[PDB]
Design an enzyme around this catalytic site. Sequence first.
Site, PDB file in Angstrom:
ATOM      1  CG  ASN A 165      -2.095   0.913   1.082  1.00  0.00           C
ATOM      2  OD1 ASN A 165      -3.066   0.525   0.440  1.00  0.00           O
ATOM      3  ND2 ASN A 165      -1.963   2.128   1.617  1.00  0.00           N
ATOM      4  CB  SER A 167      -1.824   5.645   2.108  1.00  0.00           C
ATOM      5  OG  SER A 167      -1.166   5.154   3.273  1.00  0.00           O
ATOM      6  CB  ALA A 169      -1.075   8.759   7.237  1.00  0.00           C
ATOM      7  CD  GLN A 187      -7.780   6.378   5.994  1.00  0.00           C
ATOM      8  OE1 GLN A 187      -8.643   5.762   5.375  1.00  0.00           O
ATOM      9  NE2 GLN A 187      -7.336   7.591   5.590  1.00  0.00           N
ATOM     10  CG  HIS A 188      -5.992   0.482   2.537  1.00  0.00           C
ATOM     11  ND1 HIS A 188      -6.132   0.719   1.188  1.00  0.00           N
ATOM     12  CD2 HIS A 188      -7.132  -0.064   2.984  1.00  0.00           C
ATOM     13  CE1 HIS A 188      -7.350   0.298   0.889  1.00  0.00           C
ATOM     14  NE2 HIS A 188      -7.993  -0.205   1.932  1.00  0.00           N
ATOM     15  CD  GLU A 230      -2.604   2.119  -2.705  1.00  0.00           C
ATOM     16  OE1 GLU A 230      -1.847   1.162  -2.403  1.00  0.00           O
ATOM     17  OE2 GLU A 230      -3.647   2.433  -2.038  1.00  0.00           O
ATOM     18  CD  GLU A 279      -8.864  19.499  11.204  1.00  0.00           C
ATOM     19  OE1 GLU A 279      -9.229  20.585  10.787  1.00  0.00           O
ATOM     20  OE2 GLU A 279      -9.672  18.409  11.083  1.00  0.00           O
TER      21      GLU A 279
HETATM   22  C1  LIG Z   1      -3.892  14.573   0.373  1.00  0.00           C
HETATM   23  C2  LIG Z   1      -3.763  14.257   1.847  1.00  0.00           C
HETATM   24  C3  LIG Z   1      -4.371  13.128   2.339  1.00  0.00           C
HETATM   25  C4  LIG Z   1      -4.376  12.857   3.719  1.00  0.00           C
HETATM   26  C5  LIG Z   1      -3.739  13.735   4.554  1.00  0.00           C
HETATM   27  C6  LIG Z   1      -3.055  14.879   4.097  1.00  0.00           C
HETATM   28  C7  LIG Z   1      -3.080  15.139   2.705  1.00  0.00           C
HETATM   29  C8  LIG Z   1      -2.366  16.316   2.070  1.00  0.00           C
HETATM   30  C9  LIG Z   1      -2.297  15.666   5.172  1.00  0.00           C
HETATM   31  C10 LIG Z   1      -1.868  17.118   4.865  1.00  0.00           C
HETATM   32  C11 LIG Z   1      -1.045  14.906   5.515  1.00  0.00           C
HETATM   33  C12 LIG Z   1      -3.232  15.799   6.353  1.00  0.00           C
HETATM   34  C13 LIG Z   1      -3.716  14.535   6.917  1.00  0.00           C
HETATM   35  O1  LIG Z   1      -4.950  14.742   7.655  1.00  0.00           O
HETATM   36  N1  LIG Z   1      -3.791  13.468   5.936  1.00  0.00           N
HETATM   37  C14 LIG Z   1      -4.097  12.166   6.389  1.00  0.00           C
HETATM   38  C15 LIG Z   1      -4.832  11.344   5.533  1.00  0.00           C
HETATM   39  N2  LIG Z   1      -5.320  10.155   5.898  1.00  0.00           N
HETATM   40  C16 LIG Z   1      -5.052   9.704   7.138  1.00  0.00           C
HETATM   41  O2  LIG Z   1      -5.284   8.514   7.498  1.00  0.00           O
HETATM   42  N3  LIG Z   1      -4.221  10.445   7.970  1.00  0.00           N
HETATM   43  C17 LIG Z   1      -3.777  11.727   7.603  1.00  0.00           C
HETATM   44  O3  LIG Z   1      -3.053  12.263   8.486  1.00  0.00           O
HETATM   45  N4  LIG Z   1      -5.089  11.733   4.236  1.00  0.00           N
HETATM   46  C18 LIG Z   1      -6.081  11.011   3.447  1.00  0.00           C
HETATM   47  C19 LIG Z   1      -5.617   9.690   2.883  1.00  0.00           C
HETATM   48  O4  LIG Z   1      -4.447   9.860   2.096  1.00  0.00           O
HETATM   49  C20 LIG Z   1      -6.696   9.004   2.074  1.00  0.00           C
HETATM   50  O5  LIG Z   1      -7.783   8.713   2.951  1.00  0.00           O
HETATM   51  C21 LIG Z   1      -6.231   7.752   1.350  1.00  0.00           C
HETATM   52  O6  LIG Z   1      -7.387   7.104   0.771  1.00  0.00           O
HETATM   53  C22 LIG Z   1      -5.492   6.783   2.213  1.00  0.00           C
HETATM   54  O7  LIG Z   1      -4.960   5.699   1.400  1.00  0.00           O
HETATM   55  P1  LIG Z   1      -5.510   4.191   1.604  1.00  0.00           P
HETATM   56  O8  LIG Z   1      -5.579   3.898   3.081  1.00  0.00           O
HETATM   57  O9  LIG Z   1      -6.871   4.173   0.925  1.00  0.00           O
HETATM   58  O10 LIG Z   1      -4.488   3.377   0.830  1.00  0.00           O
HETATM   59  K   LIG Z   2      -4.287   5.072  -1.452  1.00  0.00           K
HETATM   60 MN   LIG Z   3      -4.739   1.581  -0.401  1.00  0.00          MN
END
Ligand SMILES: Cc1cc2c3c(c1C)C(C)(C)C[C@@H](O)N3c1c(nc(O)[nH]c1=O)N2C[C@H](O)[C@H](O)[C@H](O)COP(=O)(O)O
Ligand SMILES: [K+]
Ligand SMILES: [Mn+2]
EC number: 4.1.1.102
Lengths: 500, 500
Positions: A165, A167, A169, A187-188, A230, A279
């Site tokens: 994965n 992603s 975070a 989340q993954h 991905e 946030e």
């Molecule tokens: C574009 C983007 C996405 C995320 C985040 C940010 C950006 C810029 C931060 C600025 C770092 C702020 C933060 O709140 N953040 C973040 C986050 N998801 C979380 O679990 N934790 C996080 O801290 N996502 C969202 C995730 O990226 C998506 O939900 C994605 O779908 C996850 O991938 P997956 O688990 O589906 O593989």
């Molecule tokens: K993803």
């Molecule tokens: Mn994923």
Amino acid sequence: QPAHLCFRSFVEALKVDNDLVEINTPIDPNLEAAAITRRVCETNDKAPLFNNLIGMKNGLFRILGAPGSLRKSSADRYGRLARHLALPPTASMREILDKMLSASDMPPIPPTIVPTGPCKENSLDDSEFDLTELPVPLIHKSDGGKYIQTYGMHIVQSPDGTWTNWSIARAMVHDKNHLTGLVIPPQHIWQIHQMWKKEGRSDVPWALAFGVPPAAIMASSMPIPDGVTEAGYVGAMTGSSLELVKCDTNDLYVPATSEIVLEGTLSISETGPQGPFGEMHGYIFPGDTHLGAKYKVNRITYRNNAIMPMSSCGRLTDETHTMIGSLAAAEIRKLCQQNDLPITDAFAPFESQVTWVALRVDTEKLRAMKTTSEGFRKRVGDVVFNHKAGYTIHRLVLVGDDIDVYEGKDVLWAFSTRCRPGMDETLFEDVRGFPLIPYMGHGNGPAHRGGKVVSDALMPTEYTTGRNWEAADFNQSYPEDLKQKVLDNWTKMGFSHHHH
Amino acid sequence: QPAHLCFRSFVEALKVDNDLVEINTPIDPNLEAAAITRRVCETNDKAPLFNNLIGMKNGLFRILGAPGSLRKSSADRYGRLARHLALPPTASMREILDKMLSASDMPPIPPTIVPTGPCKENSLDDSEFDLTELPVPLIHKSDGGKYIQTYGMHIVQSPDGTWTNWSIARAMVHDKNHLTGLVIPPQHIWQIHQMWKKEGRSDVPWALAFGVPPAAIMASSMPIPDGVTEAGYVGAMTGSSLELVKCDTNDLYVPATSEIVLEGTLSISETGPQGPFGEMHGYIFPGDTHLGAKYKVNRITYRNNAIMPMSSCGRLTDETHTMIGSLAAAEIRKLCQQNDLPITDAFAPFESQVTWVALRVDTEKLRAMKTTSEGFRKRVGDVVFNHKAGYTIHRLVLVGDDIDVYEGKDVLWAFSTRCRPGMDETLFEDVRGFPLIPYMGHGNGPAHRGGKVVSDALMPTEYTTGRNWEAADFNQSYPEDLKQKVLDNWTKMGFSHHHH
Ligand SMILES: Cc1cc2c3c(c1C)C(C)(C)C[C@@H](O)N3c1c(nc(O)[nH]c1=O)N2C[C@H](O)[C@H](O)[C@H](O)COP(=O)(O)O
Ligand SMILES: [K+]
Ligand SMILES: [Mn+2]
Ligand SMILES: Cc1cc2c3c(c1C)C(C)(C)C[C@@H](O)N3c1c(nc(O)[nH]c1=O)N2C[C@H](O)[C@H](O)[C@H](O)COP(=O)(O)O
Ligand SMILES: [K+]
Ligand SMILES: [K+]
Ligand SMILES: [K+]
Ligand SMILES: [Mn+2]
């Protein structure tokens, strides 16, 4: 290398677009870089490239702010985002989301392993770096740490090797060789961590790559399905296999052109203070620190003249709105269609702080279903709010064919005029809630459950015989030949460019 | 005469402001005049003055469209409205609403009777006019009649003589000497009609004056209290007694400078077809005719070169938003303060199609109340939704001191992030509803009852110890001296006028 496949090339593309400002005088990573970026995001200005960061040593690092934020003109509003994907800069949101969904019905194209790449130009072992001595930004004045990780990709793999994965975070510096960050259900990164914690034998092999291929960071931000790697989705999307190099200290693979790579482990036992952080909903709660996941860093590798992308997130509009909201909406559109719901389009209005998704309904199909609002709301909410793609979304707004869901004025108009409060809504209290929203984690009820609603802005005849109104607007209240006459005589009579 | 006291002078003022376009070539009242006006309203352009109306005879009539609509610049956005009230054109909404409320704690200044005025320059008796031969506009292609009355003032008096009401309610031409229109509860024209119907002896003496003093048309559009004569309220507001001339055929009094006056009766027995009409929420339902009130016209008097004002109402933004919504909000602010509720400001966001009112709370006062959200929502909703001032409003949004309720982006942000759907809301089903909203009269439930909600966007600590967050925005997430440094270096670094 193409812009969508190499971050360094993406930065070039932004310059060449007249969409970059290079700042070559010293800028402080303590708040100044993020304040400038925040201003850019609130005004849809050019992306800032900070070439002279106070504290930059031996190549670590320059910063690019606002990598996925909006442009000021309407005609290329989404151009930064289009530049992540090889699309023309004038692409619509529909076209961007379709591109992001295109790989869902394609065979994956697995990545290609190559022996080296630019991300190997420099290295620091475990005696040669200190994360507290790098120019990591303080992004918001009340943040609980310096958030190094706002636009990199975490890489973790299931114990059995079958799913890798990627992603986004958040994570912040804990000490010279550790980060803390969010790792939360569903989340993954959290799902994979739980597999390693059940196995109980070691910490999770991990890498965090910054300045990855733009097409990869967009998939990193999208809730593609459980178990889907991905890298192969991005390969199918782009039509090409991504080139990856092995980490030095573990057997994970990172994009060959990554700007900066951290290698190490994500603990299955240890936690540390994390947050608060300004946030995506626009808030920070000073002092609201909680225990987060803990990452150990064993190695850094990096390109010459490495660039760290940064999201200065908060109030509208930044990556947390353009990417989190829109990409969730895209996945929700597909999820609804795969459940046989007559949804044509979905978008998370910016005006809702990306907490709503508007779903455009094919009302000819709805009419053939011979259903009612109560039944249809329930069916849509059960599909979306029980799925991970619905995690971040607390209100679904159903609208008919006349509404462009990509236009927040029209969604607001429909919601306000077609959905009777209470009667035309179904509340969902026994679904997973998104605790980040202030009314959830800092609100009156359970932080992790409920607080969701389906609001039906379909009018009654849209279920039966068809739309029975016309809008009281210039477009719909006047015949074509009158309208054209008015337009043709407009400047002539005395009244007041598309690109702008 | 001053612009706020004489419509003819108001038209001058708009010209002199560079806020008028005079159109001197022939324009058709069948749709063309309204289409041009609709375009103006959707684009915040200059007000159109149609000096050459196809069908204009013997002085009846020219049309002014968009008399109370918005200007394009932010700095004088509300300038047309300011010009109704002798305020500078840069007045804020708060200043306009305060002006409209100012007479509520003043002695009335009753009107002055004068022997004649410009509205007597021409007359047509009951053998000399035909309302179907005047250039009455067709405003929307599907309207059920030609709506002569969109910006005049109905004048009716209680049987006992003690209350003379001035109000706007729509009316259309029925035949050569009659109109039909809306006369619906709880509106004062309806309340007075019911007094005459209970007395049972005659039809209601009536006048309809078009092109009245601007300050008078604004009070006509405001829900000032039951029993309060608008003329004396306007007198106190403006500091001067309004000059009125007696009607020729009845003992009502009309503004001396009225452009056009109809004299006659409003029946206590007869009805006739009325509507449909393209309306304030943005809709028309083709063919949805219903029986309305019936007016008989016995006399017309009018100024030389008379001008009829017209509202081409519908989707944003026109008089039905700027005046109905804002003036209701003003009265609701006062009503809440008189009920000891800690409300500082109220506004109907345009984005809600003026169906919501946002109420700004003085949270220091709220904290001293030592109350909860459920209790406070209920108290606010009971006060507002049981009163006539709340008639048109279906959602109240409570917000704390950091929100500017006059800025719809900020109201939307607060609503979306601080109000948990369901839990933080109270539904009101046993209150009068506004049937004009599509989800009411054309919706799934009772047209005239319920469908209202109080949505609490106050956070929990705003009831107890105080706000516990800071916004993740440029203003709040960065110290003052950094912010100023950024601003001072903005154009220097490479990034991009108040009047514009
Ligand atoms: C574009 C983007 C996405 C995320 C985040 C940010 C950006 C810029 C931060 C600025 C770092 C702020 C933060 O709140 N953040 C973040 C986050 N998801 C979380 O679990 N934790 C996080 O801290 N996502 C969202 C995730 O990226 C998506 O939900 C994605 O779908 C996850 O991938 P997956 O688990 O589906 O593989
Ligand atoms: K993803
Ligand atoms: Mn994923
Ligand atoms: C500014 C304005 C106000 C109104 C209207 C219009 C405009 C431009 C029309 C374009 C004609 C459209 C129509 O829907 N309309 C209208 C109406 N009230 C109704 O009972 N009936 C109506 O047909 N109001 C609102 C009323 O004017 C206010 O509610 C006022 O408070 C009433 O006065 P009162 O009963 O409080 O004395
Ligand atoms: K509905
Ligand atoms: K009134
Ligand atoms: K709340
Ligand atoms: Mn009144």
